[PDB]
Design a protein around this ligand. Structure first.
Ligand SMILES: C[C@H](C[C@@H](C[C@H](C[C@@H](C[C@@H](CCN1CCCC1=O)N1CCCC1=O)N1CCCC1=O)N1CCCC1=O)N1CCCC1=O)N1CCCC1=O
Ligand SMILES: C[C@H](C[C@@H](C[C@H](C[C@@H](C[C@@H](CCN1CCCC1=O)N1CCCC1=O)N1CCCC1=O)N1CCCC1=O)N1CCCC1=O)N1CCCC1=O
Ligand SMILES: C[C@H](C[C@@H](C[C@H](C[C@@H](C[C@@H](CCN1CCCC1=O)N1CCCC1=O)N1CCCC1=O)N1CCCC1=O)N1CCCC1=O)N1CCCC1=O
Ligand SMILES: C[C@H](C[C@@H](C[C@H](C[C@@H](C[C@@H](CCN1CCCC1=O)N1CCCC1=O)N1CCCC1=O)N1CCCC1=O)N1CCCC1=O)N1CCCC1=O
Ligand SMILES: C[C@H](C[C@@H](C[C@H](C[C@@H](C[C@@H](CCN1CCCC1=O)N1CCCC1=O)N1CCCC1=O)N1CCCC1=O)N1CCCC1=O)N1CCCC1=O
Ligand SMILES: C[C@H](C[C@@H](C[C@H](C[C@@H](C[C@@H](CCN1CCCC1=O)N1CCCC1=O)N1CCCC1=O)N1CCCC1=O)N1CCCC1=O)N1CCCC1=O
Ligand SMILES: C[C@H](C[C@@H](C[C@H](C[C@@H](C[C@@H](CCN1CCCC1=O)N1CCCC1=O)N1CCCC1=O)N1CCCC1=O)N1CCCC1=O)N1CCCC1=O
Ligand SMILES: C[C@H](C[C@@H](C[C@H](C[C@@H](C[C@@H](CCN1CCCC1=O)N1CCCC1=O)N1CCCC1=O)N1CCCC1=O)N1CCCC1=O)N1CCCC1=O
Ligand SMILES: COc1cc(CCNC(=O)c2[nH]c(-c3c(F)cccc3F)nc(=O)c2O)ccc1O
Ligand SMILES: COc1cc(CCNC(=O)c2[nH]c(-c3c(F)cccc3F)nc(=O)c2O)ccc1O
Ligand SMILES: COc1cc(CCNC(=O)c2[nH]c(-c3c(F)cccc3F)nc(=O)c2O)ccc1O
Ligand SMILES: COc1cc(CCNC(=O)c2[nH]c(-c3c(F)cccc3F)nc(=O)c2O)ccc1O
Ligand SMILES: COc1cc(CCNC(=O)c2[nH]c(-c3c(F)cccc3F)nc(=O)c2O)ccc1O
Ligand SMILES: COc1cc(CCNC(=O)c2[nH]c(-c3c(F)cccc3F)nc(=O)c2O)ccc1O
Ligand SMILES: COc1cc(CCNC(=O)c2[nH]c(-c3c(F)cccc3F)nc(=O)c2O)ccc1O
Ligand SMILES: [Mn+2]
Ligand SMILES: [Mn+2]
Ligand SMILES: [Mn+2]
Ligand SMILES: [Mn+2]
Ligand SMILES: [Mn+2]
Ligand SMILES: [Mn+2]
Ligand SMILES: [Mn+2]
Ligand SMILES: [Mn+2]
Ligand SMILES: [Mn+2]
Ligand SMILES: [Mn+2]
Ligand SMILES: [Mn+2]
Ligand SMILES: [Mn+2]
Ligand SMILES: [Mn+2]
Ligand SMILES: [Mn+2]
Lengths: 180, 180, 180, 180, 180, 180, 180, 180
């Protein structure tokens, strides 16, 4: 399956992020060589989660996304059993040691408005914080609490718009947008 | 001596921490292949001491634990002979340059209450600060002065509860708990 | 699933071999955390294939085992389309540039006699060379042509018997033997 | 073309900075082996841009200089399309996430006065911030807003005067000064 | 210029080979982003030259291809001025210290027959040895002297056919073949 | 010249510090194999200078000690020609970009009182700041301005007393003390 | 215990060899800080064993010396159980895959004559090969079969005489010689 | 002393060879910044000695050149005291374990004829082998025994002629030739 999207994903994202998105997709019964648009989505969501944890302090964030299903749930139990936050129903992306809450990071191709509502209806735990990023440069967080400073968030938006530009340069953006 | 506990310890802790706990046990006439529960304890105590010094400033802590007996006592003399703190009777774990005191780090499987009293009766030097961590997520420090920020301490509790979970997953926690 | 076998496999084989055996099992719908005996078999077979290619000359062997299914078949086509050997029905392990033939490497827990016959009935291509190794130290190759020198083969047998010893030391050999 | 200036440039600046200045010159139809004085200028301007971004915070600056023409313009579009700053007519050197503006870094051999006016007449976008450095130790920024702290700027002036000293020691400064 | 061929070239060949082919093309006034088929050809020819020198002894071959124009001609002069071979009119790829002759390596998409004749008419120096490789697996050398052993040459043919397969998988082979 | 002191110096200080002290001594016509006590002094003074610059900010200090005579004077000229401080008569150890002054670091075996007076009479430039450290743990700076925080200075005193302890353990301290 | 011999051993032998000799001595109830002459002997014997295995082919030798007691005996069992050689009574140093025999390497300070007889009376297994080296440059092997080529053995003798020279330069050779 | 020759030497030879030639010159009371032609000679002679030892077998040559005066004489004593060759009056460059003799490597700018006679009159030990290389490509060894194979020697001549070309390109060859 010689897909242009797959070759672009492998040259756009670092090898370690590509390997993690490939392990995550294969675990859930998805083929990155065939589900090439979703392949680009898992990498993008992974990178955003990594830059997000790169903002703030060194011991500030515990990274849940990127681990295997069993170990990610193991760290979630340890965080709940030492701090006291309720165990979320769905796997979140990070945990904020500064604010004592889980973070669900979203990357959308539509307006940040519908996606957050979609993620807020899924997350029954009202404690879990939600932060949505768009490929257009718009963002949206729970209670207008954007956690990070403006410049760590600005770096993420700039990166998201560069991925869009490179996709549109290869005529792959249109399929990517009409795929979410 | 093919012990499950030993194989789990070697895959749970980093090689450098394993090598240090092995050198420390052999020096005191203990075999890590036979004293496998204590082997897990020396590694756990070592890691906690390392994360503890990772909190705070770069030049903040002097690490006493993890060295050989003679060199650890050499650094203790140098700290006493330049700052003026009294020479402790027993080897401590760290020295706080910010607060000018030695720190005795404890990791217990019972309630933090009995362990601290056990360590407070041993440490005749009332100057030495005591900080106890539990596998349940509870902590306890001298004069309620927990030295580090809440999040550096939270990371240690989360790690301690993950070690417990992995031990219980392998049916090794019960023997570990009824061993201290 | 806290399995002693899994923890022993991760400490017995190098991380890169473990990662390859995990990718290979997951691709064929197998869980290394549950199929722990087979997990030890894929690692052992992988290592033997790597030591086998380490024998002989630098450009002598092309390693087919250890790649993903599609790329392994891609290299097989390239070898057939430049040398002229017939395309094998099943994926082999190596290709010998010195002798111009594919090699099927076997690692068995029974007598090398039954396993080779089992592999000779499967391999319809009589051109493909077969080389069987046992955990007891016995070996068996097609037409008594053992390809490598005696000492490269001796190193593989010694390694296979060390894996057996470590397994029996942990009381895991009996389950491993009655599992093939 | 055995030029003393070229050999001094290769031993004065790090290899990565030399490689970038060589790629930048060749793209614009310039030969570093013949345009040896300009070769020293591109390296010097590159280093100053790198030390400038080394000042301040980790996520503070986005480095535009040093990339190829197409990618540098790609990051500029992403910054404009997520923050809202106007697209500059000419390629700048950095973007300040803290102050939300592009920075044009200048390194001159004359008085900082004429060079800034020369760069202020070229930059039609009044939003773009201008910061000029001289080989004599003088500096000059837009609205007297020097962005960085005094010591990050002091390190750049010291480096610029060391390059001058090494050039004059090799009797290459006079040609370099009468070349801008 | 979002070209599928360019993204495939960057993921097919190692970064160091890609960087060398990019420097070589830009020097001769060629854009790898636009001349994407030739971009794949320079990388392929470079790799073949590197594997070719990897065959034989350690001090056997002097690599001429891959250097800048001036330095490649400098090494050619040094080889002629110490051994005595005539200075070739055109830049060759290697020099054989074992056989005391220059080697011109060719990689063609047509039959090895026409390409060698094309290269034999260009190379006036009858001393220079010619070795042609095809993407089909055929090879052809001067005086039937193929220099290397069969297996070093076999590895090159296998690699050439894998590049073809990956190109055809992405529907890029047809344009590549009808481009030489 | 098999000196115990030389073998202890090579095992006490890191190789890079040893190499710098050896280059510095040989430049001034001193043999580290014969002047073994001074060899220990140059290493100790070098390390203290390096830990001192490790305190404070990243761009805070410019390290003058440890360079060759000509380059150290080159950086001194650049600092004077961009900030405006007077050119010191003797080579200092550091420059403070935060406080805009040169620092002369001293390590003595007698009382800090006589050494500073000895260094204050030599340094005609009253602008240059003086900071003296002793092997007993006492320190002494110009105008009681100790530049660094207490804990960066405490780390230096602890290290100095450990060097003393290791020297006295090998019966080399007495010769070292009666040598300054 | 500030011993000159210990400081010389740490600067004469590489850190990895020093760490192995320290682990070996501590396991057998010996202190390298007190048994400093034997400390030099374990390092010397270890290095000679490593250079010896460095001679010959890559897969030629299996290194038994340098492992912990249990694992060294594990590899010995695997070699006996795959080749068929009798299990030696005492732990040897190497195994020769080329000649199918164990090797006992000796390093002596007396004449090679008495030491070999001392080692030949201990080794009941007449199959085990014995190879003795002296600090004077003399060697002595079983059946005059010196296994390695003359130059690999010559390198070992040269190294042994350099260790002697450095010891005598520090006036430590006399104690070392009158210690075996 | 801004010398073109010094800047060319630092960019022509690797940093490790430059550092060794600088240590060797300073030991004998020579300044590489002033004796720039000799600086180029020590580097060239060092490199040739290193390529020469790179030819042949791995354990074949013992490198005497490049060490400090005392250690080089220490290895010479060890070689004489284990093999039996007479102690040379002057420090040689290598020792051949294959042929059991010392090698004096020469690099000359005149005809190899006069230089060898100059070196043969100095070397009283007729046992020491002499091998002379010229910048023109001519070589000359004792008893026509050139030790290495033709291609290892050819690589050295090619390198020597490239150094000449780069020197003449910078107009530094004429001074270098009229300096020996
Ligand atoms: C810890 C390790 C991997 C971490 C993932 C994360 C990646 C991090 C790398 C940093 C350095 N940067 C930044 C510059 C380039 C680079 O490389 N960033 C952040 C930006 C993009 C990126 O790549 N981090 C953070 C700690 C060190 C590290 O690597 N992960 C993976 C999921 C869980 C986790 O914590 N782990 C943990 C066990 C398995 C594994 O692999
Ligand atoms: C200094 C050195 C070892 C230090 C121990 C300690 C280990 C540290 C490593 C850091 C980096 N991290 C963090 C991410 C992974 C990693 O690797 N952490 C902290 C967390 C777990 C861990 O591993 N530190 C601190 C300084 C550098 C270093 O390594 N020790 C050992 C005892 C005394 C001491 O200071 N020393 C000193 C001489 C002997 C030796 O070995
Ligand atoms: C090429 C690379 C991986 C190779 C696998 C193989 C592993 C090799 C590593 C060697 C070095 N040794 C030996 C000492 C320790 C070590 O590390 N050995 C051999 C013994 C055990 C081991 O580990 N080799 C050989 C070339 C370099 C390399 O690593 N593989 C994986 C499957 C296909 C293949 O060729 N590739 C290729 C693309 C993906 C990838 O990962
Ligand atoms: C990111 C990477 C290169 C960066 C350029 C820049 C160089 C940086 C290196 C640092 C570390 N230091 C400081 C001490 C020595 C050293 O090495 N400094 C700053 C001082 C001089 C220097 O060298 N940085 C910053 C991030 C890491 C890095 O290397 N560049 C090049 C242009 C765009 C860019 O961001 N990239 C990005 C893709 C291509 C590439 O190469
Ligand atoms: C010397 C250096 C680069 C060499 C090019 C060549 C690359 C070589 C790398 C080897 C190792 N392998 C093999 C496994 C992966 C790897 O990495 N191979 C051969 C196979 C593909 C490949 O990559 N070699 C050979 C010597 C070391 C080296 O790297 N070149 C570039 C042109 C001239 C030259 O000699 N040089 C010289 C100065 C500039 C530069 O870059
Ligand atoms: C810059 C470089 C060398 C620097 C000297 C200094 C050494 C520094 C190393 C750090 C990292 N740590 C700390 C942990 C272990 C280690 O390694 N520390 C500080 C503590 C002891 C030590 O070793 N620093 C600072 C910048 C990076 C570096 O290495 N020097 C030498 C004199 C001038 C100078 O700036 N240079 C510059 C050109 C020549 C050279 O060598
Ligand atoms: C394998 C590994 C260690 C090996 C010991 C041995 C050391 C070897 C290192 C080589 C490379 N050279 C040579 C130049 C400098 C250097 O570094 N040489 C030989 C000369 C001196 C030296 O140091 N070898 C050989 C394989 C790679 C390696 O390192 N050992 C230790 C005992 C058992 C064993 O096989 N192992 C195995 C598991 C534990 C461990 O540590
Ligand atoms: C051993 C070490 C240094 C050696 C000098 C010599 C350098 C060698 C490096 C090789 C690898 N190549 C080749 C490709 C690039 C590279 O790097 N080559 C040979 C060609 C040019 C070069 O550089 N060798 C040989 C063994 C490993 C090593 O490095 N020397 C210095 C004098 C004495 C000696 O044996 N030593 C020993 C103690 C001090 C020290 O530094
Ligand atoms: C079941 O879904 C899949 C999840 C994964 C790994 C990511 N794990 C998440 O939990 C997750 N997934 C998504 C998401 C999605 F919900 C739909 C489409 C694309 C996405 F990236 N957005 C998030 O923010 C987030 O945290 C791999 C394969 C899967 O099929
Ligand atoms: C003598 O005891 C031993 C100590 C060590 C190394 C640790 N050195 C300590 O000083 C230390 N030991 C312990 C501790 C304990 F007291 C009992 C059981 C397990 C422990 F980890 N807790 C600490 O907090 C602490 O600082 C190795 C082997 C020993 O037998
Ligand atoms: C479908 O089988 C599986 C194969 C693999 C990867 C190995 N690929 C092989 O082709 C292969 N497999 C086996 C083998 C086997 F046939 C049965 C049990 C265990 C084995 F290791 N022996 C070989 O020699 C060999 O080359 C992963 C998971 C699979 O389920
Ligand atoms: C077209 O000009 C060239 C630019 C470059 C790369 C640098 N890209 C810039 O945009 C740039 N150039 C300059 C500059 C200049 F304007 C004149 C002379 C020397 C200079 F360094 N100063 C800056 O501050 C700056 O940002 C390479 C080759 C070129 O010919
Ligand atoms: C001429 O003196 C020598 C200096 C050096 C390099 C150190 N360069 C200094 O300038 C310096 N020297 C000293 C010092 C001293 F003055 C006497 C004895 C020992 C010392 F370390 N203390 C400092 O604080 C300081 O900065 C190498 C060899 C020399 O003979
Ligand atoms: C029990 O002896 C000890 C052995 C070791 C590790 C070495 N293991 C050996 O088996 C060995 N020991 C010796 C040897 C000796 F026999 C006496 C004195 C010094 C020696 F190096 N020579 C060999 O050749 C050899 O192979 C560590 C501490 C020990 O006390
Ligand atoms: C005393 O001479 C010096 C030697 C050295 C280090 C090299 N050690 C040698 O022994 C040596 N020197 C020379 C040589 C020479 F004899 C004259 C001029 C240039 C040379 F490279 N050619 C050799 O082949 C050789 O082995 C450094 C500085 C010295 O002044
Ligand atoms: Mn998620
Ligand atoms: Mn998410
Ligand atoms: Mn402790
Ligand atoms: Mn403790
Ligand atoms: Mn297979
Ligand atoms: Mn197989
Ligand atoms: Mn610019
Ligand atoms: Mn600029
Ligand atoms: Mn060609
Ligand atoms: Mn100084
Ligand atoms: Mn000083
Ligand atoms: Mn032995
Ligand atoms: Mn010499
Ligand atoms: Mn010589």
């Amino acid at each position: 399956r010689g897909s242009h999207m797959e070759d672009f994903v492998r040259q756009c994202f670092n090898p370690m992020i590509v390997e993690l998105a490939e392990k995550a997709m294969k675990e859930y019964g998805e083929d990155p060589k065939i589900e090439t648009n979703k392949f680009a989505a898992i990498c993008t969501h992974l990178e955003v989660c990594f830059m997000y944890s790169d903002g703030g302090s060194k011991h500030r964030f515990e990274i849940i996304e990127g681990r295997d299903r069993i170990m990610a749930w193991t760290v979630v139990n340890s965080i709940c059993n030492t701090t006291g936050v309720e165990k979320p129903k769905f796997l979140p992306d990070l945990y904020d040691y500064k604010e004592n809450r889980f973070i669900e990071i979203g990357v959308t191709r539509r307006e940040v408005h519908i996606y957050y509502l979609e993620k807020a209806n899924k997350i029954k735990s009202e404690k879990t914080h939600i932060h949505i990023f768009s490929f257009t440069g718009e963002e949206m967080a729970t209670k207008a609490d954007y956690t990070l400073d403006e410049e760590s968030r600005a770096r993420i938006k700039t990166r998201l718009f560069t991925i869009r530009q490179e996709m549109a340069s290869r005529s792959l953006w249109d399929s990517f947008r009409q795929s979410e």
